[PDB]
Amino acid sequence: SFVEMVDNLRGKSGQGYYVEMTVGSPPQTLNILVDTGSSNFAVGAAPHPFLHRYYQRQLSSTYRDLRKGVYVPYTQGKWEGELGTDLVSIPHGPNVTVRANIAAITESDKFFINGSNWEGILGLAYAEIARPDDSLEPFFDSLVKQTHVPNLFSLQLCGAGFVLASVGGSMIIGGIDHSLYTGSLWYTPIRREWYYEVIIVRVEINGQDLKMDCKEYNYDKSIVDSGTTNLRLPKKVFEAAVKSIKAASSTEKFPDGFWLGEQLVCWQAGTTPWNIFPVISLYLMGEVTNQSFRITILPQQYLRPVDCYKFAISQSSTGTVMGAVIMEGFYVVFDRARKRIGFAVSACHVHDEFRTAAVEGPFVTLDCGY
């Protein structure tokens, strides 16, 4: 059923996962980054040094102007555009076509990426964080309202596994594909419908509790974001994490340029000492008040291939971000209809013959949110 949706994702390590889409009439083929960390469908629609193709409104008989501009600035650069609607389809997705909002980006700074091979972004989060405001209905809402596609989608991000390494995965829209995971799916509630916000109740390095007030883990928030490469942690949690990881791997020594995630380290062909780095367990709030469950990730996940790797755990000023390197261990279900997110061991996750990524619960925790 979702057989046609299997392996419908591709990308370059560190530069996000994208799915093929068409926009307009006749269909204009574009690769669009799948992003759970935003809520705009925004596509390059003017020439750019990093873009080799873009959305051309005038070539589309079905385009309709909303006569309204949008301007989204931030720290690095920004993105500017003009709002409109057009017919939209996902060739290796459900067999439907939808009229959706489209932000045609006419100018931008440090937004696109050189060689990433995508030309736009599909924000899969909620209207509350849409630009310019929450009246601009996001793609998935339009898709559900207009078709009979169930209000749910799931992601299997598979990473590389053994020129930036290529990655693959699957976005199953409208259902759960049981051949994509093994064992049980565990659900944590979506605390609030803007980002895909969740609550982390504790974290351990090699079974060792960091022993923090759990408000620190979600300060000022925790989100599941496919549009973020790294596991990103609040400063206080980050320092304690690195310190613990440093200890466990202190049989070998690396420069703190590595620990700061901007310096690579290299072994040569199959000699990488995985067993020297500890596993990391995040406990997420369960559907029952005082329950939780844990997802455990291996060094194969938080050391990103560049045999050279970069430390894919970094510091945050905007709360915890569970990005690709965390999702790559699991099958992640965004159950919008029941306000929840399920985690299960992925049928594609990378691991060795002594350890393996895991989803295990329940654990009883006898206030953690901002």
Ligand X SMILES: CCc1cc([C@]2(c3cccc(-c4cncnc4)c3)N=C(N)N(C)C2=O)cc(CC)n1
Q: Binding residue for ligand X (CB under 6 A) from 93, 120, 174, 227?
A: 227
Alpha-carbon distance 142 to 146, whole Å? 6
Work out whether the CA dihedral 158, 159, 162, 165 comes out positive or negative: positive
Backbone angles phi, psi at 5, to 5 degrees: -90, -15
Q: Write down the least CB distance from residue 42 to ligand X, Å.
A: 5
164 or 347, CB closer to ligand X? 164
Q: How far is the CB of 131 from ligand X (least distance, A)?
A: 6
What residues are annotated to the active site? Answer: 35, 225
Q: By CB under 6 A, which span of 35-43, 240-248, 327-335, 361-369 interacts with ligand X?
A: 35-43
CB of 218 to ligand X, least distance (A): 17
Could you say which of 188, 228, 314, 316 contacts ligand X (CB under 6 A)? 228
37 binds ligand X, rule: CB under 6 A: yes
Query: Is residue 15 part of the contact set for ligand X (CB under 6 A)?
Result: yes
Residue 222 makes contact with ligand X by CB under 6 A:
no
Per-residue buried b or exposed e for 289-311, using 16+ beta carbons within 10 Å of the residue's own CB: eebbbbbbbbbbbbbbbeeebbb
Q: Which of 13, 28, 40, 292 binds ligand X (CB under 6 A)?
A: 40
Pairing of strands 200-205, 208-209: antiparallel
Site for ligand X contains 120 (CB under 6 A)? no
User: Which of 225, 292, 295, 369 is close enough to bind ligand X by CB under 6 A?
Assistant: 225
Distance CA 106, CA 86 (A): 17
Q: Cβ closer to ligand X: 73 or 257?
A: 73
Question: Cα–chain-centroid distance for residue 127?
Answer: 18
* Residue 72 engages ligand X in binding (rule: CB under 6 A): yes
| Total residue length of the chain | 370
Give the amino acid at 38.
Answer: S
Query: Least distance from C-beta 105 to ligand X, angstroms?
Result: 9
Query: Measured from the CB of residue 160, what is the shortest distance to ligand X in angstroms?
Result: 14
- 10 Å Cβ neighbour count for 103? 28
Single out the residue of 361, 363, 359, 360 nearest to residue 345, CA to CA.
Answer: 359
Cβ atoms 40, 126 nearer than 8 A: no
Does 123 bind ligand X (CB under 6 A)? Our answer is yes
Measured from the CB atom, the residue of 71 and 267 that comes closer to ligand X is 71
Residue nearer to ligand X on the CB measure, 42 or 45? 42
Decide whether 304 or 336 has the Cβ nearer to ligand X. Answer: 304
Whether the bond between 278 and the residue before it is cis, its omega within 30 degrees of 0, is: no
For residue 220, the one-letter residue type is: D
Neighbour count for residue 50 (Cβ, 10 Å): 13
Neighbours of 267 (CB within 10 A): 12
Which region among 167-175, 203-211, 222-230, 298-306 touches ligand X (by CB under 6 A)? 222-230
User: Cβ distance 362 to 288 under 8 Å?
Assistant: yes
> What's the DSSP call for residue 325?
H
Contact positions with ligand X (CB under 6 A) in 154-213: none
Q: Determine, following the binding rule CB under 6 A, whether residue 327 of this chain makes contact with ligand X.
A: no
- Decide: is 38 part of the binding site for ligand X (CB under 6 A): yes
Instruction: Give the helix/strand (H/E) hosting 223.
Output: strand 222-224
Residue type, 68: K
Report if residue 82 touches ligand X, rule: CB under 6 A: no
Name the residue nearer to ligand X (CB basis): 40 or 346: 40
> How far is residue 60 from each of residues 26, 63, 65, 256, 364, measured CA to CA in Å?
6, 6, 12, 52, 56
Q: Contact between 42 and ligand X (CB under 6 A)?
A: yes
Q: Which is nearer to ligand X, 38 or 272 (CB)?
A: 38
**Least distance in angstroms from the C-beta of 317 to ligand X:** 13
- Interface residues with ligand X (CB under 6 A) are 15-16, 35, 37-38, 40, 42, 72, 74, 111, 113, 121, 123, 225, 227-229
